[PDB]
Amino acid sequence: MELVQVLRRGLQQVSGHGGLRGYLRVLFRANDVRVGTLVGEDKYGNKYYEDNKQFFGRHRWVIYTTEMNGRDTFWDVDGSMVPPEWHRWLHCMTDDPPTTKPPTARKYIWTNHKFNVSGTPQQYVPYSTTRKKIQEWVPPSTPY
Amino acid sequence: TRPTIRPRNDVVHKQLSAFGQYVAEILPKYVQQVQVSCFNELEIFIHPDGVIPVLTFLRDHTNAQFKSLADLTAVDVPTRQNRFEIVYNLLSLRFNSRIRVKTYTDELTPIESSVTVYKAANWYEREIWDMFGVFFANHPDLRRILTDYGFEGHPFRKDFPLSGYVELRYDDEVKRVVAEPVELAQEFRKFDLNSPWEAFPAYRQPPE
Amino acid sequence: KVKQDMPPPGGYGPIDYKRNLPRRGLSGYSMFAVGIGTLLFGYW
Amino acid sequence: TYKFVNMREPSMDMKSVTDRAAQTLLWTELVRGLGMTLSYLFREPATINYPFEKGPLSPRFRGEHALRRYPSGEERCIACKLCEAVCPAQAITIEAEPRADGSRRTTRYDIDMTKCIYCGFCQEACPVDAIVEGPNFEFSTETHEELLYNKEKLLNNGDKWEAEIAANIQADYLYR
Amino acid sequence: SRGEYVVAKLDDLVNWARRSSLWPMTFGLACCAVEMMHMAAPRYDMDRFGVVFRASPRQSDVMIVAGTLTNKMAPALRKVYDQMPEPRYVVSMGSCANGGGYYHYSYSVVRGCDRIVPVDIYVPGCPPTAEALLYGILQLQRKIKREKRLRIWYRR
Amino acid sequence: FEEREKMFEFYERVSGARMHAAYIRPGGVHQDLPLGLLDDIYEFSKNFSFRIDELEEMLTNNRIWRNRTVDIGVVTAEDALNYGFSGVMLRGSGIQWDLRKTQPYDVYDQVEFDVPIGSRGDCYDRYLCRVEEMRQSLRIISQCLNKMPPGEIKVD
Amino acid sequence: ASATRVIQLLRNWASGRDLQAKLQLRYQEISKRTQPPPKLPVGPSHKLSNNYYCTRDGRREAMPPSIVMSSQKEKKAVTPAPPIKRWELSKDQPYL
Amino acid sequence: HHALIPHGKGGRSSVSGIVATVFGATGFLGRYVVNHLGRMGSQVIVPYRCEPYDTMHLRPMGDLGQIIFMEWNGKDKDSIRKVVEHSNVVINLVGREWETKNFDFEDVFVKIPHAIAQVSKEAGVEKLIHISHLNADIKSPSRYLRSKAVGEKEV
Amino acid sequence: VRTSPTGEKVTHTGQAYDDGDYRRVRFSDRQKEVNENFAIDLIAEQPVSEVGSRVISCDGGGGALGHPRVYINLDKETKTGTCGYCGLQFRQPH
Amino acid sequence: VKPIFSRDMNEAKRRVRELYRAWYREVPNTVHLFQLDISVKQGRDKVREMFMKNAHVTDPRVVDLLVIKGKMELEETINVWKQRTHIMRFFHETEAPRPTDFLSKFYVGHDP
Numbered sequence A: 001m002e003l004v005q006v007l008r009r010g011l012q013q014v015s016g017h018g019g020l021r022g023y024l025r026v027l028f029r030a031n032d033v034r035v036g037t038l039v040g041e042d043k044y045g046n047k048y049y050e051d052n053k054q055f056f057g058r059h060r061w062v063i064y065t066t067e068m069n070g071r072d073t074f075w076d077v078d079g080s081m082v083p084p085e086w087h088r089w090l091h092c093m094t095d096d097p098p099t100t101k102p103p104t105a106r107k108y109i110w111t112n113h114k115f116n117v118s119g120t121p122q123q124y125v126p127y128s129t130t131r132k133k134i135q136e137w138v139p140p141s142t143p144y
Numbered sequence B: 001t002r003p004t005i006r007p008r009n010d011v012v013h014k015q016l017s018a019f020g021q022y023v024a025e026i027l028p029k030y031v032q033q034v035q036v037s038c039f040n041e042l043e044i045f046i047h048p049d050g051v052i053p054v055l056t057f058l059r060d061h062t063n064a065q066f067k068s069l070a071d072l073t074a075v076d077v078p079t080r081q082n083r084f085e086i087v088y089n090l091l092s093l094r095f096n097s098r099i100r101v102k103t104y105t106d107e108l109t110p111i112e113s114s115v116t117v118y119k120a121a122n123w124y125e126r127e128i129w130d131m132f133g134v135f136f137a138n139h140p141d142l143r144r145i146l147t148d149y150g151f152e153g154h155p156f157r158k159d160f161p162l163s164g165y166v167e168l169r170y171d172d173e174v175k176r177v178v179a180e181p182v183e184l185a186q187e188f189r190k191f192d193l194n195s196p197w198e199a200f201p202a203y204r205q206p207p208e
Numbered sequence C: 001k002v003k004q005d006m007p008p009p010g011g012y013g014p015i016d017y018k019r020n021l022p023r024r025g026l027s028g029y030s031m032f033a034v035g036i037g038t039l040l041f042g043y044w
Numbered sequence D: 001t002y003k004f005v006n007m008r009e010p011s012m013d014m015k016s017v018t019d020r021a022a023q024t025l026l027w028t029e030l031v032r033g034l035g036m037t038l039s040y041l042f043r044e045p046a047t048i049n050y051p052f053e054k055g056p057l058s059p060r061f062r063g064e065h066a067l068r069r070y071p072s073g074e075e076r077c078i079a080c081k082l083c084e085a086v087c088p089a090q091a092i093t094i095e096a097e098p099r100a101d102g103s104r105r106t107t108r109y110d111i112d113m114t115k116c117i118y119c120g121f122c123q124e125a126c127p128v129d130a131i132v133e134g135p136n137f138e139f140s141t142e143t144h145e146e147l148l149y150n151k152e153k154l155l156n157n158g159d160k161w162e163a164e165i166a167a168n169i170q171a172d173y174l175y176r
Numbered sequence E: 001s002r003g004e005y006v007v008a009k010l011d012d013l014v015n016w017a018r019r020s021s022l023w024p025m026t027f028g029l030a031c032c033a034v035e036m037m038h039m040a041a042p043r044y045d046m047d048r049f050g051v052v053f054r055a056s057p058r059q060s061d062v063m064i065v066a067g068t069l070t071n072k073m074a075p076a077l078r079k080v081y082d083q084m085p086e087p088r089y090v091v092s093m094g095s096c097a098n099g100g101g102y103y104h105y106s107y108s109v110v111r112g113c114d115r116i117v118p119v120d121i122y123v124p125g126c127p128p129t130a131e132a133l134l135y136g137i138l139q140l141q142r143k144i145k146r147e148k149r150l151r152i153w154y155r156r
Numbered sequence F: 001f002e003e004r005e006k007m008f009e010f011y012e013r014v015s016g017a018r019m020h021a022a023y024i025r026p027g028g029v030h031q032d033l034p035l036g037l038l039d040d041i042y043e044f045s046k047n048f049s050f051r052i053d054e055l056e057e058m059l060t061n062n063r064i065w066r067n068r069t070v071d072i073g074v075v076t077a078e079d080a081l082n083y084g085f086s087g088v089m090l091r092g093s094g095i096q097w098d099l100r101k102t103q104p105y106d107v108y109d110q111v112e113f114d115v116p117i118g119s120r121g122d123c124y125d126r127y128l129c130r131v132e133e134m135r136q137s138l139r140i141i142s143q144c145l146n147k148m149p150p151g152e153i154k155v156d
Numbered sequence G: 001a002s003a004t005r006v007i008q009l010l011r012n013w014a015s016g017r018d019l020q021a022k023l024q025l026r027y028q029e030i031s032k033r034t035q036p037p038p039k040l041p042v043g044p045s046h047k048l049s050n051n052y053y054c055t056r057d058g059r060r061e062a063m064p065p066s067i068v069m070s071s072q073k074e075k076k077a078v079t080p081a082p083p084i085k086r087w088e089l090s091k092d093q094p095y096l
Numbered sequence H: 001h002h003a004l005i006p007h008g009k010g011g012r013s014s015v016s017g018i019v020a021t022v023f024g025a026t027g028f029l030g031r032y033v034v035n036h037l038g039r040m041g042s043q044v045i046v047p048y049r050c051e052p053y054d055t056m057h058l059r060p061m062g063d064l065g066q067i068i069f070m071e072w073n074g075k076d077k078d079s080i081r082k083v084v085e086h087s088n089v090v091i092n093l094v095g096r097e098w099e100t101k102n103f104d105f106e107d108v109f110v111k112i113p114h115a116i117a118q119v120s121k122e123a124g125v126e127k128l129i130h131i132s133h134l135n136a137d138i139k140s141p142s143r144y145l146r147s148k149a150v151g152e153k154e155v
Numbered sequence I: 001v002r003t004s005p006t007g008e009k010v011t012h013t014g015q016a017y018d019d020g021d022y023r024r025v026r027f028s029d030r031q032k033e034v035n036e037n038f039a040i041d042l043i044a045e046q047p048v049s050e051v052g053s054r055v056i057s058c059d060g061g062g063g064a065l066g067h068p069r070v071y072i073n074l075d076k077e078t079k080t081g082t083c084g085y086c087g088l089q090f091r092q093p094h
Numbered sequence J: 001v002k003p004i005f006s007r008d009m010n011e012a013k014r015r016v017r018e019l020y021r022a023w024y025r026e027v028p029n030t031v032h033l034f035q036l037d038i039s040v041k042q043g044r045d046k047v048r049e050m051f052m053k054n055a056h057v058t059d060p061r062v063v064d065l066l067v068i069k070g071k072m073e074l075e076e077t078i079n080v081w082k083q084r085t086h087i088m089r090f091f092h093e094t095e096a097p098r099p100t101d102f103l104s105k106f107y108v109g110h111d112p
C-alpha cells in the first residue's frame, strides 16, 4: 500500500539527515525535514539544496550556517545571511547555481558578506559627506 | 500610414459641433461660447446664473439625455478676475456621448448648487468648497471633506503652499497631537524646467 | 533576428472561463425515501 | 454583448419542488460548501518556509539602491544630476565638485529611503548605469536614521551586491 | 551568580513567550495593507510564526502602521496606540509611514509616523514586499529576544 | 489571495514591482514583456476558472450568504444614475453601460466579451456581476494572449 | 502533487471535480527562469530616408479648439450623437 | 570647545545649538526637559541605564538625529566621559526617591553627581545644572536630603 | 584611506569631523561607514593604453553596459587623453 | 455684486450676533464634553478674540462668508467631529512666544 511507502519515505528522511540527531536538529532549526540534493555551500557555511519534485517556491531552500561573521546563528537566522551570488539562485532570479555559473570577479567586490547590522555596533550612521562651505575669519594672535 | 499620430474622427467632430450649435440656439440667455476640441470633446461656456437652467436642460430630453454627472471640479487661474473656473462633466448614456459645461466665479460670489438637478454634486460641491474657496448657495449641507476638521486655509488654490502652514506632532507635555508652524528638514527644491524656446507654434499668443 | 515574448505560432490553447458548478446528488424523492427508511428501521 | 446574471425562473414541477424542499430541509448546499473546505484541507498547503525558502523574483526587481563602479573600480556616476531631476519624490540629493584628478564626481549622493517610492526611475535614467536598485529587499532598520543613506552607504551596497547586480543587468539589459 | 542565572533564564522565557506570540492589530491605512494581507496570505502565512491578526487594540501587542498617516488620522492612531497594553511594539511599513514617502511635502500628511508614536522597526519599500514585512517582523522578534528587562531589574 | 500572489508575480516580471508599477506610461509601455511570461500567464489562466468556481461553490448558493445579501443595498436605476454611480453599481440595477463596449479606449473594440447585467440591484446581484466579470476577464485574457502583435512597445 | 491515490480520490469526491488535472500549486510547467537573450524589434520610424520628423510630428498637429459659437461678435433637431443601439443577449450563455 | 551658532526659527528642525546630556532623562522631570530641548532643536545625548524599550517614549520628542541614546554605567566614569565628551551643557537629574540595594542614597546623590560634575569639567562642559530639593540641607534629618546637600556641595 | 588626527577615517570626499565639531558624537558607540576602495587610486592604477590613431573611442567596455561613446583626441604628446566618463587614459605611441 | 446672505452691513452684523450667541452658549458644553482643562471664561475670551480678529472687515459679503465658516466650525464643535486636539489648536499652547519688539527680533534671527 501507498501508506507503507509514505512511512518508509519518512524513515528515509530520518536517515538522510544523518540520523535521529540530525533529523531533530534540522526539524528544530528549520521546521522542515525534507531531504534534497545539495547544490553547494558558500564560504560562510550556508548549505543550499534543491528538490525539483516539490512545487515552485519550495524546490530550492537554504540551511543557514550555525556561525557567520562572529555571530552564533544556530537559532537566530536571517535572510540577509545569504551571500549575493547565491541570492539570485535562491530567489529564482536565475536557474543556474553560482557553482555552475560563477559571478564575474572584480577587485572592489566584497570578499565577506555582512548580514543586516541594525541594532549592532556596526550599524550605519548617516552623516554629511561635504566639507564646510563658509570659512570664518581667524582673529590675529598678536595683541595689536 | 502615420502610425505615431493619433487618428482623427471628423464625423464625431461634426456631430458635436452641430449639437453645440443646437444647445447655443436653445438657451442663448446663458451660453457665451461653445467649442469643440480636435480630440472630439464639446465644451459649452455658460454665465454663472445658468448652472441650474442649462444643466436641467441637458438632463431632460431636448434631444439630450445627459443624466450622469461624470465629475465636478474647479480650476484656479489667479490671473482672471473670476479666478475659479467651475467645470461640469456630463455623460449621456442614451447617446453615448459626453459634453462639458464650464462657468466662472469669484471667491466672494456664490454659485447655485446643482444638488437638485443631479444629486451627485453634493460631495463634489463640498470638495470644491473645501479645496477651492467657492461657496455653493442652497447646498443641503456644505462642510469640509478631505481636509482636517480644523483646517483653515483653502488648498489647491495656487496660493496655498504645497507643504501648508501648519504641521502636526505628538507632544508629551500636553499628551496630545499639537499643530505647529511648518519647518521642513529638506526644503522642496523648486525646479525651473520650462525651456526658453517655444514648443508649439500653433498656440502662439499674439504679441500685443 | 527579432525575438520578443510572442505567442506561440498558432496561439495558446483555449482557456475555460464559464461556470462549471457540477450537478451532483440524488433526487429529493430519493433522499426523503432513504431518510424515512432509516427512521423505520431504527424504530423497528 | 450583455449577459443576464440571475433572471432565471425555478421549475414548478413536483420533482423540482421536492428537490428544493430537500435542499432547504436537508442543508444540501451547506454540505457542498463543507465538502469544498474538506477537499482544500486535503490539498497541499502553499506556504513557503521563509526564511529558508524565498519567494520568486525576476531580474527587473526594484529594491535597495546601489551605486556601481566600472570594472577598473572607478565609480560610474558622473554627477549628471539627471536622477535628482527625474526623482518623483525628491529623495536624491547630489553635490559635485571637480575632484583632484579633474574628473566630474559626486561629493554628496544621499538617497532618503524614507522618501523614495522605489519607482525604478534613475535606474532607467542614469546615462552610466550608476544607481541601480539592487535585488536586496530585506534591509529593514531599527531606527529612522539608518534609512537615510549616504554616498558611502550606497557605494558599500554596490560593492556588496555587484555580483548579483551585474548578472541581473546582463539578464535585462537587452530588454531596456 | 545563581540569582543572575535564574533571572536570565526567566527573561529568556518571557522574551520567548512574547516574541513567539506576537499579535499585530488589524491596522492598515493605505496600500501597504494589501502587502500586509499578502503576508497573511498562504504563501508567507504569518500564523506559522505565531503572528495572528487581532482587531482589539487591548488584545494586541504590535501596531503595524501600514499606510500614509494623514493629519486627520494621526490623533486616532495615537489613541489606538495608547489603548494598546504593554509591552507594545510599533512597526512602520512603507515609505509613507516611515518618512512620508511620495506625499512627504503634502499639507495633509504627517512626515513619518515616528513623530506621532515611537517606532521600533522600519520596513522600507513602497509597497514593501510581503517578504520584506515578514523579515521586519522577524527582526522585531530578534529584538524582543535581545531584551534584558529582568537582568536590569536584578542589577538594581 | 494565492492567485493574487501569482498575478503579483506577473507584475514583478514585467516591471519589477509586485504592485504600484510604472509599466503603463504615456506613449505606450516602458518595457516589453520578458521572454516566457505570456505562456506563464496561459498556465495561470487555464486553471483560474476552477478557483473562481470553487469560490462560487463556497458562496453563490449558500443560504447564509444569500440571506446576508439577497435584498440589502437596493438601488433604483434612476437613483443610481443620478447619484453618479458607475460600473457594477449601475449594472447591478440593470442599466446596460460598460465603457469598454460603449466608448472603447485601446483595443477593446477588437475583443469579444459579455457585460454581466443584474436584475434586482442588490449586493447579491453585484456579487454575481463581479464573479461573471472576472470570468469575462479570463476570456479577454485568452483572446489577448492569442493575438498579441509583434513590434514596438512605445511610440517611435 | 505528491498525494496518495486515496487522498486524491477523497479530495476529488469532496470537490466534485478532478483537482489533480488543475492544481493551484505550480510545478515544472512554469517557464524557465533563465531565458535566451532577446532581440526587440525597432519601430516604424527607424528609417534612414523619408523619415523627416515634420511628417510624423503628432504634437505639432494639435490645434486650439474650434469655436462653434461665440457670444462676443426650419432646422432639423440634432442630438449629440446617433442614439445607442440596444445590446444583444450573448449567444454563448444568455442566462447565467 | 564645542560652540554652535543658533540657526532657524526655534522649531523642531531648527538648530538651537544647545548640545545637552540630560542625565536621568527617563525621569519625570527628564520627560519634560528633553521635550523642550527637542522642540528647540537641541541635540540631546540621553544617557540611559534601563532597557531601550523604556527610553522609546523619548524618541518622538526630538527630530531625526537630535536624540542620541547611549548606555552609561552609574559607577564607571568613562561612560560619563563618553556621554559628556561633545556636550556643551550637562544636566544632572540622577535622583532615586527610594534607596535601592545596589545604589544607596549616598551613591546616587554624592558619588554620581560629583563624578558627573568632575568629568564634565574634564571634558570642558560649559554649563552644568544640578537639582536638589529646597528642603535638602546638611542638617536635614532625612538621609537622602542630607546626601543631596552633600552632593550639591561636591558638585 | 587616511586617518584624521581625531582618529576618524577620512572619506574619499575628504570628509572628517574636526575635534571641535560635536557631530562626532553620532559614532560614539557606533561606526562611521567609510568605503575603503577609493576611486581616484584605482583609476590611477590603470595602465595607459597606447593607440596609433589620432582619435579613439571609449565606450567604457561592455557596449551598451558602459557609458556613452565619446571620441578622444590624442594629438598632444605632453598629456594623455582621458575619457570623460570612464577616466581611462590613452596616448599615441612614442 | 450679488449678496451671499446680506444686502447690507447691518444684516451681516445681525448674523454675526447670532453666531456669537451660539458660540457663547456652546462653550460650556464644549468644555464638559471634550473634557478640556480650560475654564469657560477662558474659552469665551478666545471666542471674543477670534471674533474681533475679523472686526476690521468692511464688506458685507466677506462678513457673510466668515459667518458661514464660523457656523461650520460651530457645527463641528457641537458634534464630536473635532477632537480635543482640534479644539485646543485655538490655544497655541505648545508654540513658544514670539517677541514683537525690534530688538528681540534682531537678536533672534534674520526674519523681518
Ligand SMILES: NC(=O)C1=CN([C@@H]2O[C@H](COP(=O)(O)OP(=O)(O)OC[C@H]3O[C@@H](n4cnc5c(N)ncnc54)[C@H](OP(=O)(O)O)[C@@H]3O)[C@@H](O)[C@H]2O)C=CC1
Binding pocket: H023, H024, H025, H026, H027, H028, H029, H030, H049, H050, H074, H092, H093, H094, H095, H096, H097, H103, H108, H131, H132, H133, H134
Ligand atoms: N518633586 C520632584 O520631582 C523633585 C525632584 N528632585 C530631583 O529632580 C531630579 C529628577 O526628578 P524626577 O525626574 O521627578 O525623578 P525620577 O525619580 O522620576 O527620575 C530620576 C532619574 O534618575 C535616574 N537614576 C536614578 N538612580 C540612578 C542610578 N543609580 N543610575 C542611573 N540613573 C539613575 C532614573 O533613571 P531610571 O528611571 O532608569 O532609574 C531617572 O531617569 C532628581 O535628581 C530628583 O531628586 C528634587 C526635588 C524635587
Ligand code: SF4
Binding pocket: D065, D083, D086, D087, D088, D089, D090, D091, D092, D111, D115, D116, D117, D118, D119, D120, D121, D122, D123
Ligand atoms: S526609485 Fe526612489 S530614489 Fe529612485 S528615482 Fe524613484 S523615488 Fe527617487
Ligand code: SF4
Binding pocket: E030, E031, E032, E066, E067, E068, E093, E094, E095, E096, E097, E101, E102, E125, E126, E127, E128, F020
Ligand atoms: S509607501 Fe507606497 S505603498 Fe505604502 S502607503 Fe505609501 S504610497 Fe502606498
